[PDB]
Amino acid sequence: VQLQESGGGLVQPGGSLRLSCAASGFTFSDHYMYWVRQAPGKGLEWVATISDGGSYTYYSDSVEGRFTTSRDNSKNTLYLQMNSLRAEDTAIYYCSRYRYDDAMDYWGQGTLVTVSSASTKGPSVFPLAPSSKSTSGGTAALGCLVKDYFPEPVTVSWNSGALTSGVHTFPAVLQSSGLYSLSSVVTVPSSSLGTQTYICNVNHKPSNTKVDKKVEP
Amino acid sequence: PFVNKQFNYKDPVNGVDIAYIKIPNVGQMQPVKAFKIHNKIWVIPERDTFTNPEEGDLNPPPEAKQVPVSYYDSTYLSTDNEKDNYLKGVTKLFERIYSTDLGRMLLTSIVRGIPFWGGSTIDTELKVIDTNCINVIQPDGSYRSEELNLVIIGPSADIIQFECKSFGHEVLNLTRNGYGSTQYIRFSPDFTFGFEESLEVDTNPLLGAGKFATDPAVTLAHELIHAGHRLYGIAINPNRVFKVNTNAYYEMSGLEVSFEELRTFGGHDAKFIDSLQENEFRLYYYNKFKDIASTLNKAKSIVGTTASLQYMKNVFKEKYLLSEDTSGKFSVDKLKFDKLYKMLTEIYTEDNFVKFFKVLNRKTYLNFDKAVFKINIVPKVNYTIYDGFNLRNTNLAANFNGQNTEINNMNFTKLKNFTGLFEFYKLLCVRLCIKVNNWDLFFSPSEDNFTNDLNKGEEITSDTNIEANISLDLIQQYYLTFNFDNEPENISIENLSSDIIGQLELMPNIERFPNGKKYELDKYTMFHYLRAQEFEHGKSRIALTNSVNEALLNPSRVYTFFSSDYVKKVNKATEAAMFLGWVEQLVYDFTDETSEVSIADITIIIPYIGPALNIGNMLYKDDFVGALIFSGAVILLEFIPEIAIPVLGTFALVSYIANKVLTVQTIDNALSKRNEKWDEVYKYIVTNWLAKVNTQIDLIRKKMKEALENQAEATKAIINYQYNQYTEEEKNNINFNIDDLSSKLNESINKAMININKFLNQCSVSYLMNSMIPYGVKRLEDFDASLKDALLKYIYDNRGTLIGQVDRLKDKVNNTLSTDIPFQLSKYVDNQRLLSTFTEYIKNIINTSILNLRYESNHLIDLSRYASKINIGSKVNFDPIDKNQIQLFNLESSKIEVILKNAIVYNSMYENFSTSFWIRIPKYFNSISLNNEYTIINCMENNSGWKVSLNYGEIIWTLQDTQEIKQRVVFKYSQMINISDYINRWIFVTITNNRLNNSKIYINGRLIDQKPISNLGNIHASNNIMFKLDGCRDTHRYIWIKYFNLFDKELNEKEIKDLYDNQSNSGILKDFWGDYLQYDKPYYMLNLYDPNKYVDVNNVGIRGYMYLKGPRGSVMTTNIYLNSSLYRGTKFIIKKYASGNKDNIVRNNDRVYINVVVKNKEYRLATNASQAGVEKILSALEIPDVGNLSQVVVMKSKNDQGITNKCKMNLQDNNGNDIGFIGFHQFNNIAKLVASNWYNRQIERSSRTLGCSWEFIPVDDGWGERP
Amino acid sequence: EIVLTQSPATLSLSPGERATISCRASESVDSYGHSFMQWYQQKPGQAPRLLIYRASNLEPGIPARFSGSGSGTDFTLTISSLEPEDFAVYYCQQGNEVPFTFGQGTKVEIKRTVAAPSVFIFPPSDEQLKSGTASVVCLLNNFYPREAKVQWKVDNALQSGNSQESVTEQDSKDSTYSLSSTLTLSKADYEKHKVYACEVTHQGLSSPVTKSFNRG
Ligand SMILES: [Ca+2]
Ligand SMILES: [Zn+2]
């Protein structure tokens, strides 16, 4: 019994965007629907509440007059119209159902929204080569520098998601260039090294950039 | 003194007034012995065997007449004695009619209305019509011809078919062109009809039981009436009939009712003729009178007499009340005519005669005859000229007793009705079959019968004509204008040939109705439920009565609408000293089962009607009452009539420039003509109502009487089947006369019947009132609307001409058209029974609502029957204790939409109107509610309309039209206050309005705020009333609402006050919030004499005592509210002691235990009553350790009298005498709680708040303090 | 704007413990005899999950260890016996009146026996060098607690400002952390030095340790 909030993407400062949360598995036309946002690694925020029949709306002072919510009950959809965006609108956006008169009980995955003047740019991928003056024990580590990319977010997996244990993927840091950068490491046996190969799958979905990097001495 | 000679049949011929006479005949007839009882009036005491030459035999016809009752005696009236009886009988009957003021009149009228002259193929000249005479044979053999008005013959083959017959012409229709011709009434005073009444039980309680005989005087009058019309040549053509539908399973196979006959009967039958038709006739005969006047004027010669042309002319001047000028030119005075015509057609009526003879008589031709009796009115010990059958100073002068065929049983010999019981019928079946007798079926007039010109525009002039009911007062006024001699003479006339040649006036032509007639049906019909109840009928020993038919398929095919309890109680199994016994007990059971009784328009409901006739509608089982509240009387009707008032035709006025007087005369003429209009439209509705609705109710009424009879007989049988098996022996030991038994149950049945009459009485009116009249009143209120426009545009346009009096005239037009003229039924009906049911129904301000929203049998509905549709939202909440209490949440799906019927709402309806509802508004809790106004009841179409709204401590009424422009009233109330009358408590809102005045708003029947709305409007009548929280910016908010109402008028102070107490339920005790006080529910106690204290126990047991201590705290939310803490102190639970009442609501005078909650343990509140002093110190004792201590309290909400009151708990000793009301002693110490008899005394003499005034506070989300 | 002040700021606690989290409102949160206080568990990267609604009611399918309480302006969420899996930001939310607000959250951190890091050092990829910049990556692998000093030394000369640290979460087999220090240098500068090393001091290390290389 889920919902499914899509729409988002890289949008210019001053630009406008439409979010669309889809609903099924419960009589939608009955419940009040809510919009809650959360900037990347910050507090949660209430954005908008809309009544069941779609005639009453509440918005937090922050986005009042800039945003609008509405609903097409017969299509089981909820909507967030979003105009003259500012960088402070950068956040994941969650739609939710409010079971009367208790709480926001059901939530969606949440689509990402990004406001900035900057161009989409794909990540370079460099290896991090396992020295090599190893050993020992155990236990040698290797990985990937996935550098110079924007916006978030990149996704790393190893050997097509076959190797996952002993893997660490760092969060992205915003460099002084206004680009993102992260690294991906993995502890593996000094033994299986010239024998078992290790590849480093890398996906920047905002650029359509797939990179499968083979890390080796 | 009307008939001057006493005649004996054997008196010899004299050729003056006892002579053998010849009569108009097809070919040769040998003469008959007649007697001339009065100038112009002859009697032939001989079976009419000669006027209709195509009735040979007096034997019953080979295929029988379609007539409920018929009689055949080919020997009747064949001997001399019989004739001589006949002669005397008719005589006496004339004297009886003549004895009454109205009879003196009709009789004179007749003598006087001479058949015209007439024949003359030439313009200039008058000649007598030969068929209007007779030849009187003298002793010596010569014959002399005589003019003649009226002959009474003995009857034809069907003895009781009494008719008026004339002789015709080749060209002229002598009875329908003002001419007239000689009437021949077939008649007899030797038989009369037996019928059944069931309406006189509400005035004469101990009335007969069976049939009652019609008084032969009335019948004779009846036929004379017809004779009258036809003598004046004003009878309504009989191709002109009141045509009935005839195809439905329930509709009457067939039936001819002639408009003439309707007019003739008079009373309410006459009222089936719409006005547009009544006028057509009148104009037609007026014209037919004009033509006579003008023929007169043309005549310069007279033939066949020794009389003078002028004498003869003047004969007619007097007949038709023509006006003579100076020249001898005659003409017709509309005015004079109008009256004569009113007297012949509206005053000479069967009904009026019955007012005069003061006898019991059928009430509508529709009350079908039921049997035929032989009577003998000639002996004075039997029937007198003045009292008829109901002889004064005897047993019979009482409750139409003379006419009860049982009671006066030596005076009516019963006879064979020649029409079999199913000579005419239809067959009604199921997918078993029965014959239902044609005459037991429903009469259902075609719509065709009801015409009008309501749609016709009219041009109001200054000329325009202003008109200008039939009471006994009025007739007196007629009587007195009557000139009662100068009786037209007997004049000598030239002989006509020995044999007057003439055929009877040829009638239709009317066809034989098709004879049942198969109908295969899906339910059991009510005819079937009725046959079940019959038997049987019947000797050996059947009769075992049983519910759930098939009974039919026996016997004992004998169903009853009674309970197992009775069905069991008579299907034993009982002798013999136990019979005596049996019987009594079965006079009780019957009288509880039949006297059973049980909304505000149908006060009195008869529950067992549903099961009797399977009403009908007849989905089961018998919770008929429920279905009857739900839908209206409309469930009874077998067909639902169509109410078709068209858009009323508007006025348009003639402007008379530069003229004052003809301009104001045109206004006044306009306004008055309006008044006619409402009469016109109303009347029509009454006429429609009487014929299609009241009829169905009168038949069910007849049918309920009949079941009650069926049941009584079925019982009688079974008491007698048993009795007969017995002693017997002794037998001659328990003498028991079923005449006493029959005696009892008819008394009994009577007592039930006054109930059922009442009940169905209320049904008929209520139907008329709330689903007939309204459809009309809309149309009027609109016509009104547009005439106002039209009149004020008239004043503005002619405003210079009117200079001095414009305002005086805008005020005239504006007051008269703003007032809804009042429907008075008394103005359209003559009937005491109904008029007083209607008088009772108006008395009640709620029957007149246009919206009346009650929860009934699982649905919210509108008991006023205006609302077309009620949509209830997905999350509307009904309070399961009292479902009338509706909870609305701030969801858009917590909403109730009421949509009014289209052709019942009219644009100008919210100009003088009002609304009431009880609301229950929770405490406002949150800052956003400080400035937030929200609609809750919305009645607005595009910016115009009315709405009710709410804000922080406010209820708001708002009016707005049609482009401006609001006014607005406010109730205001605080949330900073200790105990509020209003916060979260049930309060009763009332709003009144008045276009030319102010909106007022009332709270619990106290006027609060008023403001002028006269600035406007006008307002736009919205189809839609939407109950919704519109705009409330408090997510969690909600309201309770109940008994919503809408009135088409401005309720006055005393009306709303009343409204206030009628909906208060003063019988049920109430908690602090105003909800029903319930048993087994923890309450916090508030003493009103010291509201700053709560209750406490110092010690449990009898060493301890309860007491008031303080303070209570406060509750508050900074800025929003700060009230007295309400959930404090020790808790009370009202525990049931005795009840009945399946339920949980603490009612006035309930006896209860009171438990006190101390540290989550329930304790019982008691005192030692023999504690010296008046005040008994109450304590909290271990529930089981109470013992014989006084602990029973009477819960109270009134006293005595019935002045309401807040002293709740009267405490009683285990003997039943009062101790005191529970209160609190103290100026001495320590406010302990006492039962004090001083209270009981004090309440009698004042209503002031006392130490015994408590309120029970339950926890409620609406108050929301935390405990 | 009802402000929801939530304390403590952070809250580190070993399993099976008691986990009081205190929320508090500048204005009331009560209407219609209901405190409209919600509580939310949010693990990283996932939609908040409702725990307790109306201050005191437990959401169907949430376990007993969680329990709500309070009323008015003072609510409190307790975890009867913590888990490892109950490291999370936790949030209180008032739904009494608009503008609905959340507290600023409370980070449950999991405890354990101090863990020493395995530490790893990474010379800049040949292809990256010829791109313009060199990035030397120093990895600390699987340690606790999170507090650590890590200076970059280049010819045992200290560098500062020219690097950023990044840290994982508690990879919740062991509630352990992992950090990467990332020194960014220009082609020009990086090949006018020889010996590169990061050096780490940490509670689990008896004396600082250094990871080193020269170019080749
Ligand atoms: Ca009239
Ligand atoms: Zn008649």
The DSSP string of B507-518 is: -----------E
Look at residue C151 and give its three-state secondary structure: strand
Chains that touch A (3 or more CB pairs under 8 A): B, C
Residues B1013 and B1104 in one domain: no
For chain C, the C-alpha Rg in angstroms (whole number) is 23
What superfamily in CATH does domain C113-216 come from?
Answer: Immunoglobulins (2.60.40.10)
Say how many C-beta atoms besides its own lie within 10 A of residue B32's C-beta: 16
Confirm or reject contact between B892 and chain A (CB < 8 A).
Answer: yes
Residues B499 and B535 in one domain: no
- What tokens does B492 get? 């000598």
Residue B4 domain flag = no
CA distances from B1051 to B842, B1046, B1058 (A): 14, 11, 10
The torsion angle over the Cα atoms of residues B1229, B1235, B1238 and B1243, rounded to 10 degrees, is 120
Residue B427 domain flag = yes
Tell the residue number behind the tokens 């040549």, with chain if given. Answer: B233
For chain B, the C-alpha Rg in angstroms (whole number) is 39
Cβ A13 vs Cβ A115: under 8 Å: yes
- Chain B CB contacts of A101 under 8 Å are 889, 1035-1036
Task: Give 3-state DSSP helix, strand, coil % of chain A, rounded to 5.
Answer: 5, 50, 40
Residues B544 and B492 in one domain: no
Experimental method: X-ray
**CA distance from start to end of chain C:** 62
Residues B733 and B595 in one domain: yes
Contact between C102 and A46 using a beta-carbon 8 Å cutoff: yes
Residues B457 and B532 in one domain: no
Say how many C-beta atoms besides its own lie within 10 A of residue B502's C-beta: 21
Compute the distance from residue B262 Cα to the ligand 2 centre, in Å.
8
Residues B1035 and B1083 in one domain: no
Say how many C-beta atoms besides its own lie within 10 A of residue B274's C-beta: 19
Look at residue B153 and give its three-state secondary structure: strand
Select which of B223, B423, B638, B713 is catalytic.
B223
Tell the residue number behind the tokens 């050729």, with chain if given. Answer: B15
User: What is the C-alpha separation between B920 and B882, in angstroms, rounded?
Assistant: 14
Cross-chain CB nearest to B1036 (options C27, C32, C71)? C32
| Residue type at position B271 | K
CA distances from B181 to B50, B263, B313, B488, B1011 (A): 18, 20, 17, 16, 73
Ligand nearest to the CA of B365: 2
Q: Compute the half-sphere exposure of residue B524: CA atoms within 13 Å on the CB side of its CA.
A: 20
Q: Which strand ranges, in their side-by-side order, compose the sheet holding C158-159? A: C158-159, C149-154, C196-201, C209-213
- Chain C CB contacts of A98 under 8 Å are 95
Residues B637 and B775 in one domain: yes
Angle between helix B661-689 and B773-797 (nearest 10): 170
**Residues with Cβ < 8 Å from C199, sequence gap 6 or more?**
C150, C151, C153, C208, C209, C210, C211
Residue B640 domain flag = yes
Ligand nearest to the CA of B277: 1
- Chain B CB contacts of A54 under 8 Å are 892
| Residue type at position B119 | G
Angle between helix B101-112 and B80-99 (nearest 10): 110
Q: How many Cβ pairs within 8 Å bridge chains A and C?
A: 119
Q: Which residues pair with B414 in a beta bridge?
A: B373
Cβ B927 vs Cβ B952: under 8 Å: no
Q: Which strand ranges, in their side-by-side order, compose the sheet holding B212-213? A: B212-213, B191-195, B371-374, B413-414
Cβ B877 vs Cβ B887: under 8 Å: yes
Q: How many Cβ pairs within 8 Å bridge chains B and C?
A: 41
Contact between B926 and C96 using a beta-carbon 8 Å cutoff: yes
Q: Give the domain ranges of chain C.
A: 1-112, 113-216
Compute the distance from residue B240 Cα to the ligand 2 centre, in Å.
15
- What tokens does B793 get? 């545009």
Identify the CATH number of the domain in which residue B1230 sits.
2.80.10.50
- This PDB structure is determined at a resolution in Å of 3.8
Cβ B1078 vs Cβ B1145: under 8 Å: yes
Residue B509: asked if its preceding bond is cis (omega within 30°), the reply is yes
Task: Give strand ranges (E) for B1167-1237.
Answer: 1175-1177, 1179-1181, 1192-1195, 1209-1212, 1218-1224, 1233-1236
**Is B223 an annotated catalytic residue?**
yes
Q: Which strand ranges, in their side-by-side order, compose the sheet holding C21-25? A: C4-7, C21-25, C74-79, C66-67
**Residues with Cβ < 8 Å from B529, sequence gap 6 or more?**
B549, B559, B612, B613, B614
CA distances from B370 to B160, B186, B192, B241 (A): 13, 21, 11, 24
User: What is the C-alpha separation between B1020 and A114, in angstroms, rounded?
Assistant: 52
Compute the distance from residue B111 Cα to the ligand 2 centre, in Å.
20
User: What is the C-alpha separation between B1125 and B978, in angstroms, rounded?
Assistant: 8
- What tokens does B942 get? 């595009």
Q: By C-alpha distance, which of C142, C210, C154, C214 is closest to C180?
A: C142
Tell me whether residue B204 is exposed, middle or buried, using C-beta atoms within 10 angstroms of its C-beta: 0 to 12, 13 to 18, 19 or more. Answer: middle
**Residues with Cβ < 8 Å from C139, sequence gap 6 or more?**
A141, A183, A185, C119, C120, C121, C122, C178, C179, C180, C181
- Chain C CB contacts of B1266 under 8 Å are 30, 33, 71
Q: By C-alpha distance, which of B823, B824, B820 is closest to B783?
A: B820
| C1-112 matches C113-216 in fold | yes
Compute the distance from residue B261 Cα to the ligand 2 centre, in Å.
5
Residues B433 and B552 in one domain: no
- Chain B CB contacts of A100 under 8 Å are 875, 889, 891
Ligand nearest to the CA of B218: 2
| A81 to chain B, closest Cα gap in Å | 22
Contact between A51 and B891 using a beta-carbon 8 Å cutoff: yes
Identify the CATH number of the domain in which residue B69 sits.
3.90.1240.10
Cβ B1174 vs Cβ B1220: under 8 Å: yes
Residues B835 and B907 in one domain: no
Fold of C1-112: Immunoglobulin-like (2.60.40)
Residues B1026 and B1114 in one domain: no
Ligand nearest to the CA of B338: 1
User: What is the C-alpha separation between B5 and C125, in angstroms, rounded?
Assistant: 154
Residue B1089 annotated in ligand binding: yes
Compute the distance from residue B469 Cα to the ligand 1 centre, in Å.
7
Confirm or reject contact between B671 and chain C (CB < 8 A).
Answer: no
The torsion angle over the Cα atoms of residues B174, B175, B181 and B184, rounded to 10 degrees, is 130
| Residue type at position B699 | L
Contact between B893 and A58 using a beta-carbon 8 Å cutoff: no
The string of DSSP codes covering B839-851 is HHHHSSTTTTEEE
Say how many C-beta atoms besides its own lie within 10 A of residue B380's C-beta: 10
- Chain A CB contacts of C141 under 8 Å are 141, 168, 185, 187
Contact between C97 and B927 using a beta-carbon 8 Å cutoff: yes
* Angle (CA) A84 A85 A88, round 5°: 145
Residue B1 domain flag = no
Range of the domain at B1090: 1065-1259
Q: Which domains does chain A have, with CATH numbers?
A: 1-117 (2.60.40.10), 118-217 (2.60.40.10)
Number of domains in chain B: 4
User: What is the C-alpha separation between C23 and C4, in angstroms, rounded?
Assistant: 7
Cβ A215 vs Cβ A197: under 8 Å: no
Cβ B874 vs Cβ B888: under 8 Å: no
| A47 to chain B, closest Cα gap in Å | 16
Residue of chain B nearest C28, judged by CA positions: B1117
Contact between A30 and B875 using a beta-carbon 8 Å cutoff: yes
Q: Which residues pair with B703 in a beta bridge?
A: none
Look at residue B72 and give its three-state secondary structure: strand
Residues B72 and B101 in one domain: yes
Residue B226 annotated in ligand binding: yes
Residues B475 and B360 in one domain: yes
Look at residue B592 and give its three-state secondary structure: helix
Confirm or reject contact between B1031 and chain A (CB < 8 A).
Answer: yes
In a mutagenesis test of the B interface, which of C1, C29, C97 is the best target, namely the one with the most B β-carbons within 10 Å? C97
Identify the CATH number of the domain in which residue B536 sits.
1.20.1120.10
Residue B538: asked if its preceding bond is cis (omega within 30°), the reply is yes
